[PDB]
Design a protein around this nucleic acid. Sequence first.
DNA 1: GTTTACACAAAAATATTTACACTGCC
DNA 2: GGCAGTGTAAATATTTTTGTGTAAAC
Lengths: 401, 351
Amino acid sequence: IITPEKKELIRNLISEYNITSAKDLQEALKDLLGDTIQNMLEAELDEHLGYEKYESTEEAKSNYRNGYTSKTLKSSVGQVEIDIPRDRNAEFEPKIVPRYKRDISEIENKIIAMYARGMSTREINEQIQEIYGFEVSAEMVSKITDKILPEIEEWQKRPLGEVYPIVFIDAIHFSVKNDGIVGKKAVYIVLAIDIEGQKDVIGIYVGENESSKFWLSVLNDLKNRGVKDILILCADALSGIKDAINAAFPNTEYQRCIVHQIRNTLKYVSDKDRKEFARDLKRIYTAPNEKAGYDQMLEVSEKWEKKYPAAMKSWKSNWDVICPFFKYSEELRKIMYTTNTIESLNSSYRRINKSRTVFPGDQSLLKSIYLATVKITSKWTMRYKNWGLILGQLQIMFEGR
Amino acid sequence: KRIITPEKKELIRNLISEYNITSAKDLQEALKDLLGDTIQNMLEAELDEHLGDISEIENKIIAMYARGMSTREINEQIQEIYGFEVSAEMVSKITDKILPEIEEWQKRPLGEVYPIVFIDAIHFSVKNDGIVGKKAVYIVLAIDIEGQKDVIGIYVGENESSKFWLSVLNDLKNRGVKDILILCADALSGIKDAINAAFPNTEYQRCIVHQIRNTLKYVSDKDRKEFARDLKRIYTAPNEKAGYDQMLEVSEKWEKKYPAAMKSWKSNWDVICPFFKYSEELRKIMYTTNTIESLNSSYRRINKSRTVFPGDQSLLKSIYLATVKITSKWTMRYKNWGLILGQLQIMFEGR
DNA sequence: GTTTACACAAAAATATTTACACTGCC
DNA sequence: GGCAGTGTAAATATTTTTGTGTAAAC
């Protein structure tokens, strides 16, 4: 839609600002933005004082005009300089450009959207300086990204649904500086499916733990946010977690997430060229009943006890926790042994934090974690397939709930 | 003072009225919408003005090319800032503007003598006339008589013949060089023959640091720290025979759980022998790698765009842009060069 | 008369360096 | 081995706005 008023404006701009080339056009862009802002500030001053420049009024006024003061603005097309009007008693606050504000490009969110991508503060600084003209340092990037800390708290207090059929807990470890020592801390992401079949990160908790009381606090946080019943909760082997699970969620059948079993048994110690033969490990969870699964587990153990460090022993010891997986239907089995639904998150967090070698504090780590989390969950619109068929049977398994 | 004409004031008023500007974002989006196609068509006409100085928008696009961004990334950024689309043809026509600058940079007059010179290779895939081939770009970095390091040359390498190295050396000598004091390049096919053919008067020995890099080509994560920790003993040795003893020791001690890399050490030991003839400071300036691995790794930090290059000139442009962006702030020279000067003048008096 | 502009400090707000306490990488 | 990075808190450095006295415009 090309309005003839716009064409008249274009011809008038080309004429009055002496545009003879494209470079003339960019310099005219700068000059025109500056002049427009100066005109609108002159209008706002006329509004505040109540009269135009040198206009006589019969009623004497306690405020006279007091010249101008300079300020360099930083806009999208480049750096401009303007002269701001000035009242005598210094009473009026500008409306277009507030006091002391020199960033105009509304670049705030963009900088954040870069930090959420995984961009270094120095990378962001170099990019902004190169492709915008004005300079924004790294500490200012940190100060800009500090602004979503209230948003982070509002997400930490987000009201949750009443019942979540399936919940997974995953840990991702990073190097963070606590009390002046850089140690490995694990962040726990709580991903849950609701009654309709939608995957959504329900919670994020920084570890900073050396106890089981932390797990009870996490479960009480989830229970306070609005949750009443969990049907299936799957977490990794962690300190005092089963007791906390049965303290606030007793009816929840806690089973050990099989993808965590395949990772902790295989990936931690495994020849890279023999690594792929997890296909024989598929035989354990494609079994019809728990007894056939245990028999296939023993067979796979005997065939792979030739080079296993300590995996099949963990299978044997934790078979008590892996047992309830078989009572669920075939589609719930599918929802369980799909490693992509957890591994996707883990790989995305790692690929976004690839450049962040060491974090200076807990809140800095939380910032990136929440940003990557929203950047990932924004794209999740496909709900789990074959649902309703899965729902119809799981609601039979758990009748009242 | 911005003395604004009354017609300009009425024009600003008309702009505010047409776009209903009340905030700064209103003004910026107004200018973006109003003048998008204007800027686009002006630039297209000025680029097509070459048979069918540079501006800020074109400098910004040059920087976008410098950071190795996709054509779609540049398109998105320009559409957001100025408000018009930029085609890949437009990007190519804009970036061809620095080609005369590159011509000037490849014909620069060089100094008479350069104490230390390094040549490094970086390999890429480029498509010429529809054939995708592996081309290695060789960067020639040299330190001058005062102690300042600066990239002397950039050369595309075809099949890595000795004729190519001889041609590179003849280019360097025509640009003004007469004698090199120390030349250290990567172990390459038939480079020493060209070196002693075009600069015979001083026996240059190569691979002061490219050899530790070549042993680290198969750098295995588990065996990195201890292997470079014990390999520091090989090049910090006081004497040549002590160096050979440490070489055999490290070879026998780390041939376990690792292929037979050390053979390259033995066969090329004839070339590594004279390295110890240099003193502690002259060795330090060499084996630190602080400037060569820095250059190639900084190039790689911008190498996010792993695309095949559409021509030699595109690769050459990107390499020149990265090189000049590094050398602009890195032209600062290093200390303690007086002892190194006294040592180079003791070893090679005439220079 | 009346207003407005212009300086040049002092004051107030903002943005940029070390500074760290380490990590990964040939 | 060294060395180039990281995010940001503390410590500065920079820029903007403000008191008012005075020169100039209306």
